[PDB]
Design a protein around this ligand. Sequence first.
Ligand SMILES: Nc1ccn([C@H]2C[C@H](O)[C@@H](COP(=O)(O)OP(=O)(O)OP(=O)(O)O)O2)c(=O)n1
Ligand SMILES: [K+]
Ligand SMILES: [Mg+2]
Ligand SMILES: [Zn+2]
Ligand SMILES: [Zn+2]
Ligand SMILES: [Zn+2]
Length: 865
Amino acid sequence: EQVFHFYWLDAYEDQYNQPGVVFLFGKVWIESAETHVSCCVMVKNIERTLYFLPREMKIDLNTGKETGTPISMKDVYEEFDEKIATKYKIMKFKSKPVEKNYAFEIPDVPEKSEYLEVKYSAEMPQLPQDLKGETFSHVFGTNTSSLELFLMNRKIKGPCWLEVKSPQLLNQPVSWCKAEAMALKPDLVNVIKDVSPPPLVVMAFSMKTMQNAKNHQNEIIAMAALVHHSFALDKAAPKPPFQSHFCVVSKPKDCIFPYAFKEVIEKKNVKVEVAATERTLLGFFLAKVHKIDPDIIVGHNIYGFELEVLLQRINVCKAPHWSKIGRLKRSNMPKLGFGERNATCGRMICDVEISAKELIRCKSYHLSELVQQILKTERVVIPMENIQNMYSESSQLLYLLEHTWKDAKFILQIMCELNVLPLALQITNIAGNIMSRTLMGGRSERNEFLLLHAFYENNYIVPDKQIRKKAAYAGGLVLDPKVGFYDKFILLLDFNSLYPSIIQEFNICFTTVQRVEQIPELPDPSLEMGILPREIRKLVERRKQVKQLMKQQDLNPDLILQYDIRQKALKLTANSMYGCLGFSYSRFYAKPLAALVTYKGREILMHTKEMVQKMNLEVIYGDTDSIMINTNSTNLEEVFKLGNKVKSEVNKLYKLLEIDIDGVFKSLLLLKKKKYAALVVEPTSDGNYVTKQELKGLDIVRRDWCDLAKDTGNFVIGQILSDQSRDTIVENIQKRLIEIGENVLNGSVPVSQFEINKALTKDPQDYPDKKSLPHVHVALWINSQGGRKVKAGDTVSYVICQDGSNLTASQRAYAPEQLQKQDNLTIDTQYYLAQQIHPVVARICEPIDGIDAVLIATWLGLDPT
DNA sequence: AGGCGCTCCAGGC
Ligand SMILES: Nc1ccn([C@H]2C[C@H](O)[C@@H](COP(=O)(O)OP(=O)(O)OP(=O)(O)O)O2)c(=O)n1
Ligand SMILES: [K+]
Ligand SMILES: [Mg+2]
Ligand SMILES: [Zn+2]
Ligand SMILES: [Zn+2]
Ligand SMILES: [Zn+2]
């Protein structure tokens, strides 16, 4: 024969222009060059695969009555061959009887049955989905895409090594890869698992734009990029994260570069290419992408801005070879990240903004905010305006260029810090989907792929693809809290992986629960574990392993964070598997199952509450799978004993479900359901312990209150949870608030602390009642005013100012720059004292005797009425 | 395009 090895990373199909064809992109080892290069493998002749369900008794389609003659596969075969194939224009086909299982939402389909599997060219006509015949009542798989068929049939689960038997040459190159090959049929491709993965080429970049003087245009004037040619995903990121890099700077049109600039560059020796026109800059960038040939391109806000601006400018400046930004040679450039994801076809796009949203929580996911929270460094901002003045002098243009470079580096460092790529790979090998899709975010597509593989594997027919809202069923139970402050130790117990465990513990599955608002019945405990509990179980085991690793002897603070993020990622994946059951647009939608899981959960929480109470214990709170207890004790060692005691008593009732000691608090300020503060006990040696403050749901943790209000609220909390007597505390609180009130009025407070942040659920243009929505109003300004544009999902920062226009506070929202720059605008001190600080402190002091709302108003110098 | 539970604010009636 003849065979070659290929490590695939990305896949792509064009069902309209090239049905039955799948393009694979990956790596190949080239011995003569001792390096891996890119390769494109075009897989052809992927055939549609349909399953015809035979009727019990034959039917006549002209009368619509049975005939008395039963059915046999020969009957079905003949009908397809004689009437169906001929009527629908299917020249060739192959078929065979098979036995498949079914367990989904189409009524009148038996659990197990024999089917006539038919296969034919994807180039031939697609049969109607609701097609029926004389011998068959239903047909499955009429609309399955080639990519799905390929991945499922070949059992490909994320990036891996493949052997391609009998490769063919192509008359003409179809990609921008170094190597190419073609497979005439899918069965020539096989997964192999005994070859270590190859390292990848990773490219991180950033760009700068500039609004042009006259015409309205965002011109790209600088780009920076860092590259690593051997970035391994099965180990710690390389240090340093890049081996090379390059920069390119261009002039708008009317401007002229500072002189000696060239020399200044040769002098300081920076790998900077000074382009004369934007078109040149773009042509150069694309040439660099083609030559470097990255498997992964990383940026910040790529999908929302950068990528669209790049393609548009490439089109406007008529830059040469736009398709080099991807790995597939194309001609027509698509626009609007669909058209985008396609534009980079073959190259995975990692957007740290998107990845950060999935892995951690921030007040905003803008680059400065991320560099601060994750890299713990400050990032300078260069406003589009100041840009122009920079071209005037050499050092300025040079500074701007170094700045762009710094952003490319920040982006890359954030990617490594969050360990984004290894995580995305792990999730892709688990779900068996496509890595570039994993990186775009979303839990549903992954869960669908995970289930598709599992059901194909177990020989099941799967549903065909089909073509915040109000709750549609009951969820978790939240206990009514016993609001107040607590001095004695509090015990918090929480069940491990509750829902995933409930699914296993009661064997809930598409295959074991009868259904069709009514809660189904638990299946007979004799039945064998179903696909769902097994798959769910595997996600829980993986999570336990990672938690075991964290438990280990003295580890790095950086690594510990990575393990914690990963552990939560696996938690979210298992919970998303439960959630998709209740996702109306899910391919495996099964609401009764979702409702049964939540039902058992509330039941279990109620029983655990009543049980702790029978032990004569005080249950002051509980959320879905937790129980909070006031031990009233001051003896830590005793509390822990009591904890393990209740734990043991509870776990005694279940086969798999296990409750644990989530934590112990030294002091607790419980305000309302899902809202509390506390000093958390952290044992050291000899029953000794340190203590750490922890907030849950308070206004202090939200993004939509200013720092001034939030820092002040945190001060109060720190004082309340304190050792100090109630008296000393109340005094300190007053002492501090009176002070804050003065500082706000005398103008001692940094303008940044007045900023309020809110994310837009929709694009600012899609709001009818706009004007009175401060964040939507500042976004409409920002947008219509300059370069970048805010869209659904972005958070907007703003401040309330004195306009001198007597409109409501909500109608006097302005951008920070807009305030600092404009003179008629000034901070509305009254608004901040009464609508920000007062509301926050009042809710926090609500249960504290001695403080009161009226009082808090007088400290702030507000008229109590 | 994982689920549902529980505040908070602007404003008009
Ligand atoms: N993002 C989330 C968080 C929680 N839950 C549901 C399912 C969980 O099983 C249950 C309990 O919430 P937990 O925070 O306690 O999550 P788990 O108990 O499952 O994991 P852990 O072992 O960390 O407690 O609430 C969910 O569906 N989605
Ligand atoms: K009070
Ligand atoms: Mg839990
Ligand atoms: Zn081999
Ligand atoms: Zn709403
Ligand atoms: Zn919990």
